[PDB]
Amino acid sequence: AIKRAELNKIANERNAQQKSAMRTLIKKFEAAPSEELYRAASSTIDKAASKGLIHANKASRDKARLAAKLG
Amino acid sequence: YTGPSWKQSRRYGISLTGSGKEIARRNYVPGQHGPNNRSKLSEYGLQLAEKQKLRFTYGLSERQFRNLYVAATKVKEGTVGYNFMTLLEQRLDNVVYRLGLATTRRQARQFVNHGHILVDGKRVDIPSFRVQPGQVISVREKSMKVPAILEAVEATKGRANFVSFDADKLEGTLVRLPERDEINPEINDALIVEFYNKMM
Amino acid sequence: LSNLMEVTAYIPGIGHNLQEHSVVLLRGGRVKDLPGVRYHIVRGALDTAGVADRKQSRSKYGAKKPKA
Amino acid sequence: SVKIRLTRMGSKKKPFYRINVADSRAPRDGKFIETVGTYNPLVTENQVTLKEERVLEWLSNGAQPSDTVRNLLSKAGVMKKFHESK
Amino acid sequence: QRKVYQGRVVSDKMDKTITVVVETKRNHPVYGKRINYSKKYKAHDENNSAKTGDIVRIMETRPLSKDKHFRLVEIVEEAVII
RNA sequence: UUGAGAGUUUGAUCCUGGCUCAGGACGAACGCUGGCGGCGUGCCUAAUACAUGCAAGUUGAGCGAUGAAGAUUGGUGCUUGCACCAAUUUGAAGAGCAGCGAACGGGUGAGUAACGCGUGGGGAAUCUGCCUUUGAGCGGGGGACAACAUUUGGAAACGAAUGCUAAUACCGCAUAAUAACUUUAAACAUAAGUUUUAAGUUUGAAAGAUGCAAUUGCAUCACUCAAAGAUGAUCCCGCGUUGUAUUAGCUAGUUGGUGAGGUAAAGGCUCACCAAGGCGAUGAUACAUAGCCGACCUGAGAGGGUGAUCGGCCACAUUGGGACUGAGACACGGCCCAAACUCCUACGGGAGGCAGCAGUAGGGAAUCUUCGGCAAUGGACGAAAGUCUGACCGAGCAACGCCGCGUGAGUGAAGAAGGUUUUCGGAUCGUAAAACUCUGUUGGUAGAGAAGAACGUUGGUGAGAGUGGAAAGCUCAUCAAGUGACGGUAACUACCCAGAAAGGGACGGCUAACUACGUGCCAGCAGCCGCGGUAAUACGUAGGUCCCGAGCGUUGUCCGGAUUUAUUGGGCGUAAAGCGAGCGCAGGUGGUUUAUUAAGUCUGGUGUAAAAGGCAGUGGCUCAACCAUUGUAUGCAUUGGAAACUG
RNA sequence: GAGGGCGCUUCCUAAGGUAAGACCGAUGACUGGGGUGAAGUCGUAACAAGGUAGCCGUAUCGGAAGGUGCGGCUGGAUCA
């Protein structure tokens, strides 16, 4: 209650706004058997990369369906 | 604390060796029931009688007595009564009392309790210091020239077993420990132990 | 009794000083000779005076060791 | 992640530490892992229980000794043993 | 993979799941005799090879789904219906 | 590894049999008395409500930036130096952008009746910064923005216009691929399957930091992210973890299958679709009640009983519910919503929750104090220094418990003066006793000292990696260096005068302690028998006594006795009791013998409380009590053997 | 152009209302039984073959102890 409100709102604001910059990055999903389109969809974990929250096994569970006919 | 002995001296007729003095005439409890007649007792009455003679003859309290007497009821080596009555000498006023210097144990408890006799580098304020055998008892010369001690305690006398009696320095060293072979009033574990220790 | 129970418990001793709207201590006590009771009252309490040198404890029923 | 600390265990004027390998999260009086040695600095004096083995286990894993614990290890030569592994 | 139990099934009708009876005699501290007790374990069927009389054995593994805790894989005991 | 009963239906006995009570323990109270010191402990109580302080910051080794420097030189006025030009940095708190714990520490048990608790397995469901430490670069440019411009609004609360820095911020984007998958073969592989290499994919930084200096390269770190350990978690299962069957039928995502979303993950974990099961009368649901465990009081034990305080787990944060962040929270001191209080409001709006430590008001049996600092640790950042911590350490409250000593001791006792009874004698004071001789427990005072409460982080020396490099720095082998709060602290000398410092309960028995004694079934006493109606050891009453002590006694709770649910350790003819008799359901029990089996059964290895606790020992606040230590002692488990019994 | 807050409906959805219960407590005019106390009053029963021995289960008539009857047993007699 000193500055940890700023610790809540600046973080939550900034990277939740990055998650707004992650929602349609996941979606807008055609099948697209394209190497570059799967570099996009595969790159979705790694699009901001320090506030991108490259997370443990998140790419893998987001590679179950994604790899499961990625095209 | 420091109560009289109409009970030891009168309700038994014997103030035993916590004081030692056989008292004079009129061995009843006087005032009322002094010129009057006797009474009787039971097995409760001599559980009672034995715990009060061994306890209240000496100068012991009952809190310290029954707590350290369950601590005399520790081991289970058959007859524990040697471990009971063996811890009748391990108080220091009894040790000087069996050096024969003090008239009663209450006298050595008094003028040992005052911090007069400095038993090995400590201003002695417990004469029920638990005694270990084969150790000396250092006695201060100021205590040796206390005129109450010069009147009675330094006024030397005979000496019991189980120690070494330095008459020149009024000291002692616990050689062996006295026991049922050594000391014998009517000590009964049924009476005192089966009066106190979970009456049984 | 706020818990719907006996309007009684025994006052020991000779006499009493209390009246209505007085806080009353509650001995857990029973007398067979006293019918319809479950409890007694602690006389020798904060609201109790008496006469000391009683041959039982000198100090119940509103008493003390006598300061002369 | 891993630490090594004392343990306050004693009287009003006779404390008694007891060295216990710990963490940043570890309660220094409550939850623990396992204590290694019992310590008393200035009575009578420089009194310590040492085994010099599980400190090597949790330095193979890597821990953080305290002030007099680390200086006790400099009074134990296992830091010179870290010169030896060095 | 690891552990083991044994007993008759109650319901040999379900798909990819089947229970087991338990005989286990465990102690009554007053009475002293170890007393039978029947726990139930509904779990895997391979091809739904369900028969009255047989005994399947468990696997301490991933549970299948809800209520299917082991994988009752191997039918070690096989009886015949009457 | 042990074992008593009392008084009671007794016209009289035994037995069944209940009622009585001693003993101990209390987070207890109360009448009295309350000595000292040491060791501890103390809203069990209304998850009541809170004015009143403190409870988590951090660095200027990134950055903006006021102030002090005047980093007083520049007319440094002429005041005989300086109002100033004020040289640009100790640039001043050196605000605020950045990181960290924010989930520490800490309480409170409201709820919670079983994967929560306490054991055992598993990731063939899994994660893990902070540490050890592997490959491993510290690419790559851009741009608004805290602060500052700054104009405002607003009662405040709180924002907004406004451009720009800075980044120890962000971000695209090649460079990172065993990470995941895209491959091609399979040793392996278990219903699922696990496992080596055989083709293609994502993207990194504080190009930072203080510096150092240099074979111009060397240290502390974040993404490069693995290479594991390590820690701390995740969920599933075995095990035991309350009462009510006057707690019967229960269950709708219920239970399977397929798919998808999620997750760290198999998993109706969810959700879609398609299937209809399943549970349960050998207790499922519904209701009450409960934080649980180690442990701990009592019982000889069997056990009963408790969960206080301590430690672990779980749960919670006025109430209820969501959700971001964060590696990790659905978060005492995050957010958002609602409600309930409260405060301010000019009524248009804002703000908060002591079940944190205090402390206040409630309510009682239940106050610890509205005290200091973090050195003695503990944590957090910070290169270090430093910083904060109502955690902790201590001081003060409570006889609230445990210990320990004591208020006198020794000689001297005559019944002595003295009290009381008194058949007139005898009798108290029982070893201060009426005197005498002394003494300093605790305290008197003077106080010498005054308790070590203490380790290097800071600098030097020297060693190692000797770090292309000796530099510098890092490892850690030395010295210098503060390690205060109880403080003149316990202890010790001078010890003062026996002078300052013992009372409480009890006497009809029931268990030991009865006569003066108004009484007169009177008033009262009492756990049981009871009593008191004229001399009551019952009571009021004095003396004598009986047991204890700074505690006595009282009830409130619990254990034992009680074998009074009798496994240990019952009975059923009449004293309580065999159904009102038959079946033939489960369930229980098994004629003999051959052999297997080792399931159970016995042996060996394996798990076991971090602990704390017992059986011992050690030291110590002396010695005390108890603390500190050190072992010992254990279905906590899993694995070889035994065919003697049962199966 | 992508993407982005807002732009923008729905899902779950905390609370509040609804209805028709069930549970559980409190509560209640009058009223049924039981226990306690008087020592009123009614009565002879139950106790001896206790004055008709009973004692049961049951039906039925009494103010009430109780009776009558169905059947059974001595925890019943003089001894049948």
Side-chain angles (χ1 to χ4, degrees):
Chain A
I2 300 297
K3 294 295 290 183
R4 296 177 182 87
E6 286 79 1
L7 180 65
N8 196 0
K9 62 175 175 62
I10 299 301
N12 189 355
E13 184 270 331
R14 194 177 185 181
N15 63 11
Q17 188 59 254
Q18 181 57 255
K19 291 171 73 175
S20 72
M22 195 175 180
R23 177 259 181 96
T24 50
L25 274 299
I26 296 166
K27 293 183 176 67
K28 190 174 67 67
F29 181 75
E30 203 264 328
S34 176
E35 179 70 29
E36 180 63 31
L37 271 299
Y38 177 70
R39 288 170 198 266
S42 178
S43 71
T44 52
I45 308 297
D46 197 354
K47 298 302 287 184
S50 72
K51 300 288 104 175
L53 281 77
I54 300 173
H55 187 69
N57 296 319
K58 185 178 75 174
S60 68
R61 63 96 177 169
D62 293 330
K63 201 65 73 69
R65 177 69 181 172
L66 179 59
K69 292 298 292 182
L70 59 93
Chain B
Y1 188 71
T2 183
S5 81
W6 68 85
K7 297 298 293 292
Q8 301 297 320
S9 299
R10 304 303 174 92
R11 296 296 297 161
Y12 309 111
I14 42 169
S15 178
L16 295 177
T17 61
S19 295
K21 262 64 180 299
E22 173 65 33
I23 203 168
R25 294 179 181 175
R26 303 292 289 164
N27 286 319
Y28 294 100
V29 278
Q32 303 292 321
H33 298 169
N36 293 322
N37 290 318
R38 65 183 185 273
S39 66
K40 290 183 180 180
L41 290 176
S42 67
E43 293 179 353
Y44 180 76
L46 267 76
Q47 286 186 356
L48 178 67
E50 187 64 33
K51 63 92 175 179
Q52 289 293 108
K53 65 182 72 175
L54 189 142
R55 204 278 317 279
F56 190 73
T57 296
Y58 295 169
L60 285 162
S61 70
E62 189 54 47
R63 187 181 302 275
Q64 183 177 8
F65 180 75
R66 72 188 179 271
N67 287 311
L68 296 178
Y69 195 76
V70 174
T73 323
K74 291 288 186 67
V75 297
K76 296 194 291 182
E77 291 182 353
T79 297
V80 192
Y82 296 101
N83 297 311
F84 285 105
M85 69 179 290
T86 294
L87 277 77
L88 297 179
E89 187 64 26
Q90 296 182 359
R91 298 166 76 247
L92 181 62
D93 57 348
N94 197 3
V95 180
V96 182
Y97 178 73
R98 298 297 186 186
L99 294 171
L101 297 172
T103 303
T104 175
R105 304 185 191 184
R106 191 173 297 276
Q107 189 176 11
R109 181 162 296 276
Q110 181 65 255
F111 301 101
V112 158
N113 202 351
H114 283 286
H116 293 163
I117 291 175
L118 302 179
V119 185
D120 289 331
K122 285 171 69 175
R123 186 175 66 87
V124 174
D125 51 357
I126 293 176
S128 68
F129 173 76
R130 289 183 298 275
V131 178
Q132 295 294 320
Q135 291 180 356
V136 299
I137 299 165
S138 66
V139 174
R140 186 176 180 176
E141 189 178 1
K142 184 177 77 68
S143 68
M144 291 174 66
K145 66 184 179 68
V146 167
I149 284 171
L150 289 170
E151 189 181 5
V153 175
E154 194 271 334
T156 56
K157 194 181 170 66
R159 171 251 165 191
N161 292 319
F162 56 79
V163 289
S164 76
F165 177 67
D166 194 358
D168 181 75
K169 298 180 184 294
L170 302 175
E171 301 179 355
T173 296
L174 188 65
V175 174
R176 68 180 186 272
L177 279 79
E179 61 188 3
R180 179 60 180 83
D181 296 332
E182 294 290 329
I183 308 172
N184 193 6
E186 294 290 327
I187 293 174
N188 195 1
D189 303 331
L191 295 178
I192 304 172
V193 177
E194 292 178 350
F195 185 78
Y196 290 120
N197 300 323
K198 299 295 179 68
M199 294 183 183
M200 187 174 177
Chain C
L1 285 178
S2 68
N3 46 5
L4 277 74
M5 200 169 71
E6 63 179 5
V7 284
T8 182
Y10 180 61
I11 300 290
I14 307 166
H16 61 87
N17 55 0
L18 77 156
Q19 196 53 45
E20 296 182 352
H21 298 283
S22 64
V23 56
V24 172
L25 279 76
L26 187 63
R27 184 186 293 273
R30 177 70 171 173
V31 173
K32 289 181 179 179
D33 290 326
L34 291 170
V37 306
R38 289 183 182 177
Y39 291 156
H40 295 169
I41 301 302
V42 180
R43 291 290 304 273
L46 56 91
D47 54 355
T48 304
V51 174
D53 202 358
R54 297 288 297 274
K55 71 173 178 180
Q56 189 173 2
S57 73
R58 294 177 181 174
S59 66
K60 288 183 181 180
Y61 307 100
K64 296 186 178 180
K65 185 177 180 180
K67 300 295 184 291
Chain D
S1 178
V2 185
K3 291 177 178 178
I4 295 168
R5 63 186 66 186
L6 293 171
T7 300
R8 278 169 167 164
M9 186 180 287
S11 297
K12 291 183 181 179
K13 291 181 181 180
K14 292 180 181 177
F16 186 82
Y17 297 99
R18 185 175 71 185
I19 297 168
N20 193 336
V21 58
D23 290 327
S24 66
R25 295 177 179 177
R28 67 103 184 268
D29 288 329
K31 186 179 179 180
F32 294 107
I33 298 171
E34 181 180 2
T35 186
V36 179
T38 66
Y39 184 72
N40 200 354
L42 261 285
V43 43
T44 169
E45 294 189 353
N46 197 358
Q47 299 295 322
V48 66
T49 299
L50 291 174
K51 292 179 182 180
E52 305 297 329
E53 180 178 0
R54 293 178 178 174
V55 61
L56 274 64
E57 298 176 356
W58 294 99
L59 278 175
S60 298
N61 296 315
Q64 296 299 318
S66 289
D67 306 332
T68 316
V69 179
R70 176 257 178 88
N71 297 314
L72 179 65
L73 296 180
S74 294
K75 292 178 183 179
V78 294
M79 301 173 74
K80 182 61 71 174
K81 185 268 306 175
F82 180 73
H83 286 172
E84 294 169 357
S85 66
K86 177 178 283 189
Chain E
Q1 294 178 356
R2 275 83 60 188
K3 290 178 95 289
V4 60
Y5 290 107
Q6 182 178 2
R8 176 68 182 91
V9 189
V10 169
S11 181
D12 55 356
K13 187 176 67 64
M14 286 294 294
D15 294 332
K16 290 190 189 177
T17 181
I18 258 172
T19 185
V20 66
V21 304
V22 172
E23 181 59 33
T24 294
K25 276 83 68 178
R26 64 193 182 186
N27 195 3
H28 190 275
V30 172
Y31 191 72
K33 189 257 286 181
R34 288 188 287 266
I35 303 167
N36 49 2
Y37 186 78
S38 179
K39 309 173 191 181
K40 308 304 290 171
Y41 296 98
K42 302 176 184 178
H44 181 74
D45 311 332
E46 293 178 351
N47 297 320
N48 200 357
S49 64
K51 185 184 287 292
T52 292
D54 304 343
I55 295 165
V56 197
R57 267 72 167 182
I58 75 168
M59 282 190 182
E60 183 183 2
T61 51
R62 298 180 292 172
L64 288 174
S65 181
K66 187 186 281 183
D67 308 331
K68 298 175 295 301
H69 304 281
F70 296 104
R71 297 185 81 176
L72 266 285
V73 171
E74 64 279 15
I75 304 171
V76 176
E77 190 271 331
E78 294 181 355
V80 180
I81 298 171
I82 308 171

